[PDB]
RNA sequence: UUUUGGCAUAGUUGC
DNA sequence: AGTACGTCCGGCCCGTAAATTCAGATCT
DNA sequence: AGATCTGAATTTACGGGCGCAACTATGCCGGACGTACT
């Protein structure tokens, strides 16, 4: 059989390459100058070059000959090896679609309505707009009043809208797309798209158990990991050799007494200690609180790092200064010198710490930072807590026994007890002194002297300010 | 833009080409002197080669 | 448990303490140094025992310190897991019990105590009771507790009390 | 109330 | 509908190795 | 005695290095796409 040979071809131009040489064949297979190629392959995921089959490269340097979108594999040609020629034609392969073209490429878009017609439906999306402010984009909802306020192409049918090119939306944006320009098949969106419109977790180091089978409660560290049949690699107590377990014989089973991390769920992120191994209801408190955190087995994860479990001074306004309580996803919990919890927007601004600033207790007591602080007189009278960050009259006090506010709390500090020159840069004369006469611009000035460049000759030098008199 | 090229950097040959293309032919006038004036006018260069 | 142990110090003497008195001042500064302090492998070091033998005093090149090693028969606490020790409990609270060993402090958590033990709020000591009140657990009395576990973090060891082994309590 | 900031090949010049 | 505008994708030298050629080991 | 390889002793390309510190100039994305405005 013939061979087929790789030629080099213009990127995203392959298939048009193949139709003008078919065409070329049909316009010189009666000629004096027949192709005498066998046949053109163009794969479709392939991009960038095309297969010729012919027994000869002769023949498919004389058969591309006249064609240019192939002309960087014209003095060349590569032979595809006689093993792999099966896998030139190998091929492989009210929901949710994700656009192709324009500025909504890769978005989540909710089907709302199935044109039968076969050409376009009905999609659901977040607009990527500037509401036509900035030219002459992040999702966020759809606002009708800006839009309405900035005019422009606009069409108000209360909360139906046209706007931008003819963008259809309501109340969110409702367009027509075609199906071919969108992907029907393997968006599967997050709980988080559904609010805007089983799995295995095995680790190395980890121990997990034996449910079932003749080798049943034999519990091991884990070494490997795959996908759905782990065929896992446990170091057994009291074994030395490795057997072989799938992901669904395993469950992840911990002693008590030992670091535990949750991997998913409403108790994510916490560490502690499991006391009591229950069936399934596994128990454990964590290094931050002392509250009851009940957990499946699954739910666990041997690790072994300090929980993380912060505390930037922060100016909620010229006249109050905030303390960062709790770290959100787009906001602050500051609690202030008030005492008040507050919640705050990103954009507070950053107050230069003075970390060497003196304050005076309940007893005449210079403290500083730092230091342990006894409360009392005020609401928060008899605890005890370390200063972090001062006021005037207030003291921010932390305390790891207190669960409120990441420990940290505010009193007044009498409640506590320990446990430019205007010359720079003027034109100024020498009337006194040995230089006088001349005239020159005050670089850096004191108490006493200043330096002047001289204008006269090319140096500066140092006069006392009675010496100078202002022009 | 080619030939301003060629005069803006000394280099000699196509821009893409200058790992053996030969420079050093358009250089800054020097303006010190008359003199350094009219030997930089005159001044001719042997390539190492 | 305090063990008598020879272990290794640094002390770099700056020039000013030179002069007479110089052993007296590496000796004073080592008192001052390792006295109250904890280290996490190696315990609770109580008291110098005393100081066996002074090291050579290598003068720093570029920075005019001179480094001594010295070691030092010290003694030094340290907790042990499996280990029944007497203690002293300090704090009694609903959600546990904290007892002194030394200077370190161990814990008895609302599960490690026993369920037999039930915290009792309403009467004036607050303390944990049996219902046969056999065994009283309330704040300065002499537990014998088995340490579960020496939780070491930052140079400060927290050891866990139990009283799941019979014997175990007052005496 | 505190300052900053590039890498490169080529060219010329100075003991 | 045309064209501008802007954003996005593609001489020596000395070792050093390597290729050829006579005695020596077999194998007649 | 001879062959026939065959195992150690002469001739060819081929990298890879080439004394020290300042002052000035140029250039590092173009083609295609794609839509919005007039």
């Given at each position: 059989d013939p061979n087929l040979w790789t030629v080099k071809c213009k990127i995203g131009e392959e298939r048009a390459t193949a139709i003008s040489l078919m065409r070329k064949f049909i316009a010189y297979?009666?000629?004096?100058?027949?192709?005498?190629?066998?046949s053109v392959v163009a794969p479709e995921?392939?991009?960038g070059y095309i297969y010729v089959e012919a027994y000869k490269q002769t023949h498919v340097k004389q058969a591309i000959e006249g064609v240019g979108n192939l002309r960087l594999g014209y003095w060349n040609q590569q032979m595809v090896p006689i093993k792999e020629?099966?896998?030139?034609?190998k091929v492989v392969k009210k929901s949710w679609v994700r656009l192709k073209?324009?500025?909504?490429?890769?978005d989540i878009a909710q089907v709302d309505y199935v044109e039968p017609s076969q050409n376009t439906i009905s999609l659901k999306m977040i607009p990527r707009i500037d509401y036509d402010r900035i030219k002459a984009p992040p999702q966020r909802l759809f606002d009708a009043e800006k839009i309405r306020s900035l005019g422009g192409d606009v069409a108000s049918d209360g909360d139906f809208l046209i706007f931008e090119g003819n963008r259809y939306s309501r109340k969110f944006l409702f367009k027509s797309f075609a199906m071919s320009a969108?992907?029907?098949?393997?968006?599967?969106?997050?709980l988080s798209e559904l609010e805007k419109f089983r799995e295995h977790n095995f680790q190395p180091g980890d121990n997990v158990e034996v449910?079932?089978?003749?080798?049943?409660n034999l519990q091991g560290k884990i070494l490997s990991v795959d996908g759905n049949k782990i065929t896992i690699m446990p170091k057994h107590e009291d074994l030395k050799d490795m057997l072989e377990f799938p992901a669904q014989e395993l469950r992840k089973y911990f002693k008590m007494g030992d670091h535990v991390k949750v991997?998913?769920?409403?108790?994510?992120?916490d560490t502690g200690l499991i006391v009591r191994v229950e069936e399934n209801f596994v128990i454990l408190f964590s290094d931050l609180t002392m509250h009851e955190l009940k957990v499946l087995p699954r739910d666990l994860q041997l690790c072994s790092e300090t929980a993380s479990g912060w505390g930037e001074l922060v100016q909620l306004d010229p006249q109050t200064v905030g303390v960062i309580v709790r770290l959100e996803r787009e906001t602050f919990q500051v609690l202030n010198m008030y005492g008040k919890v507050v919640t705050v927007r990103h954009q507070v601004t950053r107050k230069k710490d003075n970390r060497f600033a003196v304050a005076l207790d309940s007893e005449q007591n210079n403290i500083h930072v730092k230091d342990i602080v006894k409360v009392?007189?005020?609401?928060?009278?008899?605890r005890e807590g370390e200063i972090r960050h001062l006021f005037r009259s207030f003291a921010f006090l932390h305390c790891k026994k207190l669960v409120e506010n990441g420990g940290m709390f505010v009193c007044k500090t009498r409640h506590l007890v320990l446990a430019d020159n205007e010359l720079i840069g003027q034109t100024v004369?020498?009337?006194?002194?040995?230089?006088?006469?001349y005239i020159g611009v005050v670089k850096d000035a004191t108490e006493s002297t200043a330096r002047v460049e001289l204008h006269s000759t090319c140096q500066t030098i140092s006069v006392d300010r009675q010496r100078l008199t202002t022009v | 833009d080619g030939l301003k090229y060629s005069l803006a950097?000394?280099?000699?040959?196509?821009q893409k080409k200058a790992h053996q293309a030969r420079a050093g032919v358009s250089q800054v006038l020097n303006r010190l002197t008359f003199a350094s004036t009219l030997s930089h006018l005159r001044r001719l260069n042997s390539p190492i080669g | 448990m305090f063990y008598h142990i020879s272990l290794e110090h640094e002390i770099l003497l700056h020039?000013?303490?030179?002069?007479?008195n110089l052993l007296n001042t590496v000796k004073q500064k080592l008192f001052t140094e390792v006295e109250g302090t904890c280290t996490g492998?190696?315990?609770?070091?109580?008291?110098?025992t005393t100081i066996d033998n002074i090291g050579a005093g290598v003068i720093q090149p570029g920075r005019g310190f001179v480094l001594y090693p010295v070691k030092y028969k010290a003694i030094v606490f340290r907790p042990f897991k499996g280990e029944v020790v007497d203690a002293v409990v300090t704090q009694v609270n609903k959600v546990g019990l904290f007892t002194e060993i030394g200077p370190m402090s161990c814990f008895i958590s609302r599960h490690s105590i026993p369920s037999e033990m039930e915290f009792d709020?309403?009467?004036?000591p607050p303390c944990y009771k049996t219902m046969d009140e056999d065994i009283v657990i309330q704040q300065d009395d002499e537990i014998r507790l088995?340490?579960?576990?020496?939780?070491?973090d930052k140079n400060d060891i927290f050891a866990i009390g139990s009283l799941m082994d019979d014997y175990l309590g007052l005496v």
């Open positions: 297979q009666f000629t004096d100058t027949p192709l005498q190629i066998k995921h392939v991009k020629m099966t896998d030139v034609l073209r324009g500025i909504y490429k890769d969108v992907i029907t098949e393997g968006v599967k969106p997050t449910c079932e089978g003749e080798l049943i991997i998913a769920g409403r108790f994510e992120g009392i007189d005020g609401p928060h009278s008899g004369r020498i009337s006194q002194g040995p230089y006088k006469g | 950097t000394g280099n000699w040959g196509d | 020039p000013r303490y030179f002069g007479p492998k190696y315990g609770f070091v109580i008291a110098v709020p309403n009467s004036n088995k340490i579960v576990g020496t939780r070491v």
